[PDB]
């Protein structure tokens, strides 16, 4: 199981609220 | 990939918002009213967002799936999946920059605390009611101040010249007018004097304006407001190159551009040191927001928007209903209002309009974006149809119907059914019955797979059709498919952990779920219409989790007291009670005849006895002497007979009942004999002994044999209710009427005038309660043992002596809806039937009870919710952190010269802190033993009156807890596992039996929410001797100290609080600092500050267990202690601070200790409410999900804090495997290779 639409919608909602939320591990940053 | 360790936030910069966006919307249009298609370069636009239909352009040239990653030259739409319409973010380029409402209208204002100005003044700057000064070139002004001062002196000399000129010009005219004139003249003189006075006043006002402009020009600096507007209008044209100012957001952008965070942050660290007092607090409130922007990678430039982002269309959808009418979302109207005013502003910029209309349009735009981001925050909300406020972007996130709350915590699920439950007593515990018509659909793909695997179906579609049609061939396969493929059964409300359980689905014909009778207590599910929800776990990992963790057989023991929850109740209990219970004067009885006959009631085998029973000769409940082989005898009879060899096929004689042998035949081979009537408590201790001694499968099976046998014998028990069977006590006439003679007499005392109505009203209650008691007793003296009513209650199956008393005899006194008892009781059995009045009085308490149990479930649910959301993070992270600290459990206080009643809750299933030293010092047991009864009785035998046990309370582990400190897990019955979410287990364990209370749940939620009690009973501040002076209906308690300080005195406490019983407290006694003074509830805060954390840690447990102990429930302390821990993991800071810490904040203990050392701070212990503790977290997602999403999102966004996802409630929200059970790296990344010795032959 990858990522729920219930996360993506919250991510995109917070991106639409102009809150720059970004995903990254210990070494290397991830992409949406 | 689905692997992101952490989650960082910040503030969206116009650059990043542009980088996000694929196209720019630049027309105020949604969808064409005629054709219902998206409009070009507007909202919902395919070119910028994504295609309406899957692989189809707007114009309709490219509609094939074959090609991808190409833009159509005509329209400009890219041909991909439609799902991108719920992904590809848009943007809007604002002609004038616009600030975010969150960093402005937030309390306190983040921009306001950054730039240091009043929010009422900051409002005026943003909403174009005042100019603000951005950058003053002080040097060039200072260098050329004197020339401008001289110009100002000439400009004063000019208005002075004008002033004297006009006065001179007037005076001569008035003198001339009066001279030509000479009531008629004096009036004209006065008018002239008034006019020249007005001309003087004008010159005075002008000079005042010039001097004011000079003063305000000499006093210039950045972040300075102008109210007049004409002053700035004058200061624009003259002295314009020396400074710069503006009005709106561009001004704040220009202020942020001309800003140095380091110097500002540094100065703030000095201004706090300089002026210690009230202003230090304000400077320190100002410090935190500024200090945050330094370490933050994102710049505070992004606080203002040049471009604003646009949410994916699908989350603000315009879908036509079955007819034509639109049920449009509000966001569309806000975005429309914004893009309209943006287009109009851009058109006003293109035109070259005056400043006023542009500033007004910028105010309108600002208000539109403000309303878009937060509606009904500033002044009035935006409304469309019928005066309802428009759902904003932030309104998606906030509220009970918020994204965080509603649309993330509870969802609908596929591969899942619901149905009505029926009993399935044929089924083994692990089995459950599934309705075949449900099952068929519920496993449709799984059965399709096997139907394509077999040569039943030629292709998938024919298998789908075959299973859809319900053809005869499917049924032979569906069992082959369902064979050991478990299902998760749920019964809402899902209170406790076992409220979900996995089962083997046996196919049944019908439309009902045949549940197991034992698991009904594990669901709290009656068969009174109560539905259950089946879920099919699909993954191998899920299938495993179901099979191992939560398969009903594997978890017999509740995660509460570690008592077997799946034990026999209701019928089974009376069944086994009848089965095993002994009866004198029975059939085939043991006689032991003299001279003539043999002993008769003696049988070679249980087989023989069964044959003697089935044939009319032997009664099951007869004290017969049977010779057994397969069964193990009682512990005393083990020694006296064999004491060397065992009994796999030996022989020994037992003086029992056939039923007790048929019972022991169910219990396991090596389990010894019972020879006793099987009361539900006896069953409880037996299945407990089986649970602690034997494997779990032995318990699962033996309790199932007890179920089957129990039910089989429940029938032939003869437990049936009849008007004959329900009797009345024959003295009920004598005992009741006598209790009239005492009552009526009081009336005869009242009519004369001695006793008052209220004392009479109580004495009546006493008398009729005594009357109720007399009947309550007398019933059992009369009622025979075999009586079904007596069977049902005295087995412990169900029902109480109260219910039997209110069924037969009388209900007694029943309560009013206030709580007060009605003085005239129900003087008649339900068997006799109540009089209309006696019934009508009974209705009150019953409806009150229904109204209370209606309230209880939701309150218990909320308590459960809070207790989960506080201890959501508390897992077993490591095995052992190794700490000597613990808690000292009572365990036999002075004697026998004794066992505590609450050892099982307090001591049992825990690891020992210290080596069990005694008077001699022959340490019988070392630290880290699971504390089985042997240990407890060995420590009682050893001669110690206290034992130190390791607690979560005193666990030195930073993250979660260590396995050893928690103790033996109740679910498993072994040492707790190194990933268990003991937090949620404890939470649910505490939360569930709130429904089984009546003081009660108020006291529980009051104690857990850590509030000031309803009865504020103080504690002793200092230890000393008590002396009490009785004032005018008041207690003056003074405690004379033993140490040598000031005596503790109290004055104004109510007379009906009552003193503690320690005989009773009076003058001439010595009281401890620890103990409570008066009856009621000790304030936790008071106990914490006086007796430290460890005492209040015990006090909470003691005061929150007593309610369960009173209401007949058993929770193990450790569960409470996981909450009482999560409470006391914070400190309130007094002064010093050191690293920008605030006075009267809530900071975590471990991270505070790391700062406290200060190698190159003053914090006190605090006890906070579980809601406050759940609010106080590092993970912004959880805090945002709990309450006040805006407040915490704003506070977090500025801080740019990186969420580690150490907590699991966030991992639920983001949807990654949770850090607990089977999702921790040491479990989820286990590499299992098959052994070379096994792989060799293969
Ligand atoms: Mg029910
Ligand atoms: Zn096209
Ligand atoms: Zn530990």
From Swiss-Prot, chain A:
It comes from the Bacteria. Belongs to the RNA polymerase beta chain family. Mutations in the RRDR sequence (residues 423-449) confer rifampicin (Rif) resistance. Rif blocks transcription initiation but not elongation. DNA-dependent RNA polymerase catalyzes the transcription of DNA into RNA using the four ribonucleoside triphosphates as substrates. This subunit often mutates to generate rifampicin (Rif) resistance. Interaction with RbpA partially restores Rif-inhibited transcription; once the subunit is Rif-resistant however RbpA no longer stimulates transcription. The RNAP catalytic core consists of 2 alpha, 1 beta, 1 beta' and 1 omega subunit. When a sigma factor is associated with the core the holoenzyme is formed, which can initiate transcription. Interacts with RbpA, which partially restores Rif-inhibited transcription. This is DNA-directed RNA polymerase subunit beta. It comes from Mycolicibacterium smegmatis (strain ATCC 700084 / mc(2)155). The gene is rpoB. The chain holds residues 1106 to 1137 of 1169 of the full protein.
Curated annotation (Swiss-Prot), chain B:
One of its GO terms (molecular function) is DNA-directed RNA polymerase activity. Signal peptide: none annotated. It catalyses: RNA(n) + a ribonucleoside 5'-triphosphate = RNA(n+1) + diphosphate. GO terms for biological process: DNA-templated transcription. Zn(2+) 2 binds at residues 881, 955, 962, 965. Keywords: DNA-directed RNA polymerase, Magnesium, Metal-binding, Nucleotidyltransferase, Transcription, Transferase, Zinc. Belongs to the RNA polymerase beta' chain family. The RNAP catalytic core consists of 2 alpha, 1 beta, 1 beta' and 1 omega subunit. When a sigma factor is associated with the core the holoenzyme is formed, which can initiate transcription. This is DNA-directed RNA polymerase subunit beta'. The gene is rpoC.
